[PDB]
């Protein structure tokens, strides 16, 4: 029988970041399919991430949504989370290319523009929060595994963990919740609108991206949404994962995984439930 496979899309429109686009389209789609953008980490690739999170493609088969795997061949295969272009709405670079991949997909498959989501690990988690801050008009939910608060690397000469200024990855950058909220506002000056629901994950033993970044991400998004922790669930979804539920639970939740390092493995069902797809 025919089987869907990951395939590179060689022309998806304008590509300011000079990125690759790969797509997994199930053989049977929902009538108005959702789109999940799945973002690899540094030194990774679209094909690598397709293998790294093995439960995503079967979930697409079961639910009839489309997976878009962008790929970066620049800066140690890291996503640009440092330049003004990538960090800003309509600015350019990788984030605009990713949005163009989304628009290509919505147009070709008559997809549901209200059901575009993004998930990523490490560098890809960092980019997922860039997409949340700079393109909240495109994305309705994000799931960031082992990343860094939006804007931490603003101005940096690169976005990999090998640059000279490694203050963010080393956990040395602490800003107030208000400062992190104002950072998010800088992604789209004058925008006073919604932001996609944000789910963040980090491991307490991460030697690459300090778990201090989890605390900074919590400050950032609790300020954006104006929420505080209302409930904590132990061992949720797995032993040692502490789930922090903020407000009424509809905008921001966070998971700190005891003993886990770089990166927290993707919990597909937790992320799909967050996106409302299951
Ligand atoms: C956006 O919100 C700020 C307060 O955060 C306010 O000063 C500004 O007037 C608002 N923009 C518009 C167009 O109303």
mmCIF file with all atom_site columns, N, CA and C in Angstrom, residues 186-215:
data_model
loop_
_atom_site.group_PDB
_atom_site.id
_atom_site.type_symbol
_atom_site.label_atom_id
_atom_site.label_alt_id
_atom_site.label_comp_id
_atom_site.label_asym_id
_atom_site.label_entity_id
_atom_site.label_seq_id
_atom_site.pdbx_PDB_ins_code
_atom_site.Cartn_x
_atom_site.Cartn_y
_atom_site.Cartn_z
_atom_site.occupancy
_atom_site.B_iso_or_equiv
_atom_site.pdbx_formal_charge
_atom_site.auth_seq_id
_atom_site.auth_comp_id
_atom_site.auth_asym_id
_atom_site.auth_atom_id
_atom_site.pdbx_PDB_model_num
ATOM 1  N N  . UNK A 1 186 ? 8.366  44.061 21.723 1.00 0.00 ? 186 UNK A N  1
ATOM 2  C CA . UNK A 1 186 ? 9.308  44.515 20.698 1.00 0.00 ? 186 UNK A CA 1
ATOM 3  C C  . UNK A 1 186 ? 9.229  43.681 19.430 1.00 0.00 ? 186 UNK A C  1
ATOM 4  N N  . UNK A 1 187 ? 8.738  42.445 19.524 1.00 0.00 ? 187 UNK A N  1
ATOM 5  C CA . UNK A 1 187 ? 8.641  41.607 18.334 1.00 0.00 ? 187 UNK A CA 1
ATOM 6  C C  . UNK A 1 187 ? 7.670  42.191 17.322 1.00 0.00 ? 187 UNK A C  1
ATOM 7  N N  . UNK A 1 188 ? 6.705  42.985 17.773 1.00 0.00 ? 188 UNK A N  1
ATOM 8  C CA . UNK A 1 188 ? 5.687  43.550 16.886 1.00 0.00 ? 188 UNK A CA 1
ATOM 9  C C  . UNK A 1 188 ? 5.236  44.860 17.502 1.00 0.00 ? 188 UNK A C  1
ATOM 10 N N  . UNK A 1 189 ? 6.011  45.927 17.310 1.00 0.00 ? 189 UNK A N  1
ATOM 11 C CA . UNK A 1 189 ? 5.723  47.178 18.020 1.00 0.00 ? 189 UNK A CA 1
ATOM 12 C C  . UNK A 1 189 ? 4.326  47.687 17.709 1.00 0.00 ? 189 UNK A C  1
ATOM 13 N N  . UNK A 1 190 ? 3.615  48.080 18.763 1.00 0.00 ? 190 UNK A N  1
ATOM 14 C CA . UNK A 1 190 ? 2.266  48.574 18.635 1.00 0.00 ? 190 UNK A CA 1
ATOM 15 C C  . UNK A 1 190 ? 1.208  47.499 18.601 1.00 0.00 ? 190 UNK A C  1
ATOM 16 N N  . UNK A 1 191 ? 1.597  46.231 18.480 1.00 0.00 ? 191 UNK A N  1
ATOM 17 C CA . UNK A 1 191 ? 0.632  45.145 18.527 1.00 0.00 ? 191 UNK A CA 1
ATOM 18 C C  . UNK A 1 191 ? 0.158  44.962 19.958 1.00 0.00 ? 191 UNK A C  1
ATOM 19 N N  . UNK A 1 192 ? -1.147 44.991 20.128 1.00 0.00 ? 192 UNK A N  1
ATOM 20 C CA . UNK A 1 192 ? -1.814 44.906 21.415 1.00 0.00 ? 192 UNK A CA 1
ATOM 21 C C  . UNK A 1 192 ? -2.825 43.774 21.400 1.00 0.00 ? 192 UNK A C  1
ATOM 22 N N  . UNK A 1 193 ? -2.471 42.648 20.785 1.00 0.00 ? 193 UNK A N  1
ATOM 23 C CA . UNK A 1 193 ? -3.413 41.588 20.536 1.00 0.00 ? 193 UNK A CA 1
ATOM 24 C C  . UNK A 1 193 ? -3.172 40.351 21.371 1.00 0.00 ? 193 UNK A C  1
ATOM 25 N N  . UNK A 1 194 ? -3.682 39.228 20.872 1.00 0.00 ? 194 UNK A N  1
ATOM 26 C CA . UNK A 1 194 ? -3.559 37.933 21.520 1.00 0.00 ? 194 UNK A CA 1
ATOM 27 C C  . UNK A 1 194 ? -2.166 37.358 21.302 1.00 0.00 ? 194 UNK A C  1
ATOM 28 N N  . UNK A 1 195 ? -1.828 36.378 22.129 1.00 0.00 ? 195 UNK A N  1
ATOM 29 C CA . UNK A 1 195 ? -0.667 35.537 21.888 1.00 0.00 ? 195 UNK A CA 1
ATOM 30 C C  . UNK A 1 195 ? -1.096 34.080 21.940 1.00 0.00 ? 195 UNK A C  1
ATOM 31 N N  . UNK A 1 196 ? -0.434 33.213 21.173 1.00 0.00 ? 196 UNK A N  1
ATOM 32 C CA . UNK A 1 196 ? -0.808 31.795 21.166 1.00 0.00 ? 196 UNK A CA 1
ATOM 33 C C  . UNK A 1 196 ? -0.565 31.167 22.528 1.00 0.00 ? 196 UNK A C  1
ATOM 34 N N  . UNK A 1 197 ? -1.318 30.109 22.826 1.00 0.00 ? 197 UNK A N  1
ATOM 35 C CA . UNK A 1 197 ? -1.078 29.425 24.082 1.00 0.00 ? 197 UNK A CA 1
ATOM 36 C C  . UNK A 1 197 ? 0.310  28.796 24.069 1.00 0.00 ? 197 UNK A C  1
ATOM 37 N N  . UNK A 1 198 ? 1.019  28.962 25.186 1.00 0.00 ? 198 UNK A N  1
ATOM 38 C CA . UNK A 1 198 ? 2.432  28.611 25.276 1.00 0.00 ? 198 UNK A CA 1
ATOM 39 C C  . UNK A 1 198 ? 2.626  27.489 26.282 1.00 0.00 ? 198 UNK A C  1
ATOM 40 N N  . UNK A 1 199 ? 3.313  26.436 25.853 1.00 0.00 ? 199 UNK A N  1
ATOM 41 C CA . UNK A 1 199 ? 3.686  25.314 26.702 1.00 0.00 ? 199 UNK A CA 1
ATOM 42 C C  . UNK A 1 199 ? 5.205  25.205 26.674 1.00 0.00 ? 199 UNK A C  1
ATOM 43 N N  . UNK A 1 200 ? 5.841  25.217 27.849 1.00 0.00 ? 200 UNK A N  1
ATOM 44 C CA . UNK A 1 200 ? 7.298  25.129 27.925 1.00 0.00 ? 200 UNK A CA 1
ATOM 45 C C  . UNK A 1 200 ? 7.707  23.947 28.792 1.00 0.00 ? 200 UNK A C  1
ATOM 46 N N  . UNK A 1 201 ? 8.871  23.380 28.473 1.00 0.00 ? 201 UNK A N  1
ATOM 47 C CA . UNK A 1 201 ? 9.406  22.208 29.156 1.00 0.00 ? 201 UNK A CA 1
ATOM 48 C C  . UNK A 1 201 ? 10.898 22.414 29.355 1.00 0.00 ? 201 UNK A C  1
ATOM 49 N N  . UNK A 1 202 ? 11.425 21.958 30.491 1.00 0.00 ? 202 UNK A N  1
ATOM 50 C CA . UNK A 1 202 ? 12.870 21.980 30.685 1.00 0.00 ? 202 UNK A CA 1
ATOM 51 C C  . UNK A 1 202 ? 13.263 20.876 31.654 1.00 0.00 ? 202 UNK A C  1
ATOM 52 N N  . UNK A 1 203 ? 14.511 20.431 31.544 1.00 0.00 ? 203 UNK A N  1
ATOM 53 C CA . UNK A 1 203 ? 15.064 19.436 32.451 1.00 0.00 ? 203 UNK A CA 1
ATOM 54 C C  . UNK A 1 203 ? 16.005 20.075 33.451 1.00 0.00 ? 203 UNK A C  1
ATOM 55 N N  . UNK A 1 204 ? 15.944 19.597 34.700 1.00 0.00 ? 204 UNK A N  1
ATOM 56 C CA . UNK A 1 204 ? 16.752 20.195 35.762 1.00 0.00 ? 204 UNK A CA 1
ATOM 57 C C  . UNK A 1 204 ? 18.244 19.927 35.598 1.00 0.00 ? 204 UNK A C  1
ATOM 58 N N  . UNK A 1 205 ? 18.628 18.947 34.781 1.00 0.00 ? 205 UNK A N  1
ATOM 59 C CA . UNK A 1 205 ? 20.024 18.553 34.636 1.00 0.00 ? 205 UNK A CA 1
ATOM 60 C C  . UNK A 1 205 ? 20.637 19.005 33.315 1.00 0.00 ? 205 UNK A C  1
ATOM 61 N N  . UNK A 1 206 ? 19.955 19.880 32.579 1.00 0.00 ? 206 UNK A N  1
ATOM 62 C CA . UNK A 1 206 ? 20.406 20.308 31.260 1.00 0.00 ? 206 UNK A CA 1
ATOM 63 C C  . UNK A 1 206 ? 21.748 21.036 31.359 1.00 0.00 ? 206 UNK A C  1
ATOM 64 N N  . UNK A 1 207 ? 22.782 20.479 30.715 1.00 0.00 ? 207 UNK A N  1
ATOM 65 C CA . UNK A 1 207 ? 24.120 21.065 30.737 1.00 0.00 ? 207 UNK A CA 1
ATOM 66 C C  . UNK A 1 207 ? 24.383 22.007 29.570 1.00 0.00 ? 207 UNK A C  1
ATOM 67 N N  . UNK A 1 208 ? 23.494 22.047 28.587 1.00 0.00 ? 208 UNK A N  1
ATOM 68 C CA . UNK A 1 208 ? 23.662 22.878 27.402 1.00 0.00 ? 208 UNK A CA 1
ATOM 69 C C  . UNK A 1 208 ? 22.940 24.207 27.556 1.00 0.00 ? 208 UNK A C  1
ATOM 70 N N  . UNK A 1 209 ? 21.656 24.153 27.908 1.00 0.00 ? 209 UNK A N  1
ATOM 71 C CA . UNK A 1 209 ? 20.841 25.336 28.155 1.00 0.00 ? 209 UNK A CA 1
ATOM 72 C C  . UNK A 1 209 ? 20.437 25.288 29.620 1.00 0.00 ? 209 UNK A C  1
ATOM 73 N N  . UNK A 1 210 ? 20.966 26.215 30.412 1.00 0.00 ? 210 UNK A N  1
ATOM 74 C CA . UNK A 1 210 ? 20.750 26.188 31.849 1.00 0.00 ? 210 UNK A CA 1
ATOM 75 C C  . UNK A 1 210 ? 19.259 26.169 32.179 1.00 0.00 ? 210 UNK A C  1
ATOM 76 N N  . UNK A 1 211 ? 18.843 25.368 33.163 1.00 0.00 ? 211 UNK A N  1
ATOM 77 C CA . UNK A 1 211 ? 17.438 25.404 33.601 1.00 0.00 ? 211 UNK A CA 1
ATOM 78 C C  . UNK A 1 211 ? 17.011 26.754 34.164 1.00 0.00 ? 211 UNK A C  1
ATOM 79 N N  . UNK A 1 212 ? 17.951 27.658 34.465 1.00 0.00 ? 212 UNK A N  1
ATOM 80 C CA . UNK A 1 212 ? 17.552 29.021 34.805 1.00 0.00 ? 212 UNK A CA 1
ATOM 81 C C  . UNK A 1 212 ? 16.677 29.618 33.711 1.00 0.00 ? 212 UNK A C  1
ATOM 82 N N  . UNK A 1 213 ? 16.875 29.189 32.460 1.00 0.00 ? 213 UNK A N  1
ATOM 83 C CA . UNK A 1 213 ? 16.065 29.705 31.363 1.00 0.00 ? 213 UNK A CA 1
ATOM 84 C C  . UNK A 1 213 ? 14.598 29.326 31.504 1.00 0.00 ? 213 UNK A C  1
ATOM 85 N N  . UNK A 1 214 ? 14.307 28.208 32.172 1.00 0.00 ? 214 UNK A N  1
ATOM 86 C CA . UNK A 1 214 ? 12.919 27.849 32.463 1.00 0.00 ? 214 UNK A CA 1
ATOM 87 C C  . UNK A 1 214 ? 12.268 28.899 33.348 1.00 0.00 ? 214 UNK A C  1
ATOM 88 N N  . UNK A 1 215 ? 12.974 29.326 34.400 1.00 0.00 ? 215 UNK A N  1
ATOM 89 C CA . UNK A 1 215 ? 12.451 30.378 35.268 1.00 0.00 ? 215 UNK A CA 1
ATOM 90 C C  . UNK A 1 215 ? 12.225 31.668 34.495 1.00 0.00 ? 215 UNK A C  1
#
